[PDB]
Amino acid sequence: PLQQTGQLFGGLVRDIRRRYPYYLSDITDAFSPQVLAAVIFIYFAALSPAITFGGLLGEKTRNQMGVSELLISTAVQGILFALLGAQPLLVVGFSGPLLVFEEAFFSFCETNGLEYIVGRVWIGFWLILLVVLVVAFEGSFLVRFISRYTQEIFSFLISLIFIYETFSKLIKIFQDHPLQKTYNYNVLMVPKPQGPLPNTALLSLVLMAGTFFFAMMLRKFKNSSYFPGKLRRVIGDFGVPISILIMVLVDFFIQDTYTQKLSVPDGFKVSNSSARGWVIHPLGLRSEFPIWMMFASALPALLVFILIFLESQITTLIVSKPERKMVKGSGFHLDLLLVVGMGGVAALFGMPWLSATTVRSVTHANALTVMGKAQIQEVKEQRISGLLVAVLVGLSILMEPILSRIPLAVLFGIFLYMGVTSLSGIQLFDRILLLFKPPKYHPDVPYVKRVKTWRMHLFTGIQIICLAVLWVVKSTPASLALPFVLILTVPLRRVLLPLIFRNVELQCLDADDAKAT
């Protein structure tokens, strides 16, 4: 999939030739209850980041882009990606790096007297030109140099960041409503409570812990020896929906105590009708857009292209490992074209550009993964689940009476489940656990039986230094430089690691398919 043909758009043509023959199977393979349970899981897993990032974006850009724009962009791009993409298991949505870029660009436009939304339109115009050229010259063949080293470092870092943010949300909940001896019983509740409230933080903790506990218990019950196998596996597939239902019911039957719920906009309208409409004029809304910024938009377009490219291509690498039993093929050129071009077009409507998010896509792949009699047997590779998730995200505004009764704490427990279960296939997480085990308990794997214990521990420790370096970069104002520092790991594996490790050691420790050299 990563070979270079030498023909213009050759990689694009190969990806369509590889995956579109399976299009009929991509509809029939979805006829199973596990696909529906995956739909219900990934619906919340995709809606909650949309609502949170839409709120943050509306706060940080004076609602020039907000919740409604993000929901509509997510729905439309998800529908078009599920209908046309070459790896339908990817989940397309907004991410943290994109939010940071939006903050930086809004600050830049505020400093230079620029219209932020028109600048986004021109960045999107330059994004279309870039992704067409990269796909034309098969630029996605460079993904082959991202080995398991860089992939697993990125995956472990993103999972750790996800878990950290999930816990920080609960910490913020505890800070807003602390445990106090006395409370002001007359507190304004609209739009949000104006002071601390009793029982709120502790009940949020109880809801989050209970949701995580029920999800993990039903995941264990799936592999258990209890009940008939068909009924057991059906309940196990519906583990997350059942956990969400149980905890939402628990919160519903507790009336007096306040908990924060999901809040969607009233209708399909722009977040600021006093600022912009549904179509943004590239020449400007209030003032004339300067000519120099039309060409200077290439540099932010280069940065956004790099961000989306690295995130989406590494996510495609992670979800399409040979050891995950994906027997239908993935298209690196076609998916990149679709994602970046849809983002560039959506910029014209004042809507965010999206990326193939790693935690959401990995969670989607795991929810569709079938476990045999342990060992991965197959994956329900189909387009219906992602299409339904996107459709439900688009319909989220209309189903407010249902979403308004779902607490955020339940979703926090679901996020914790997603974060812990996203670490299963990572060999870096496995080797970190080996640091806390005696060498006689190390598994029979090629990087244990062919590599000395302290050599393997040194290899793992070098990766941890990269993890710390990347974590520091994120927690700095220069957090948009994270893709470049991640890229720097590729020379580290290919130039510096052979200086201290032998070839057989590196083949055992950095193997594309978990092979014994």
């Binding site: 213009l8 115009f125 279309i128 030109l129 067409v132 050229l133 034309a136 010259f137 722009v270 009708s273 006093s274 600022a275 912009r276 409409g277 179509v279 004029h281 590239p282 020449l283 400007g284 809304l285 209030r286 003032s287 004339e288 014209l348």
Partner: protein, 40 residues
């Protein structure tokens, strides 16, 4: 649009057609240059 917007000579469909046309010309020029190279 929304509220009061400055009137431009080209409308939104006209300006986006112009931008896409210039983009297509640039892409075609780049592809023709690449085709010319690697042959002589």
């Amino acid at each position: 649009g929304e509220r009061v917007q400055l009137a431009h000579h080209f409308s939104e469909p006209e300006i986006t057609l112009i931008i896409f046309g210039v983009m297509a010309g640039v892409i075609g020029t780049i592809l023709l240059i690449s085709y010319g190279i690697r042959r002589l």
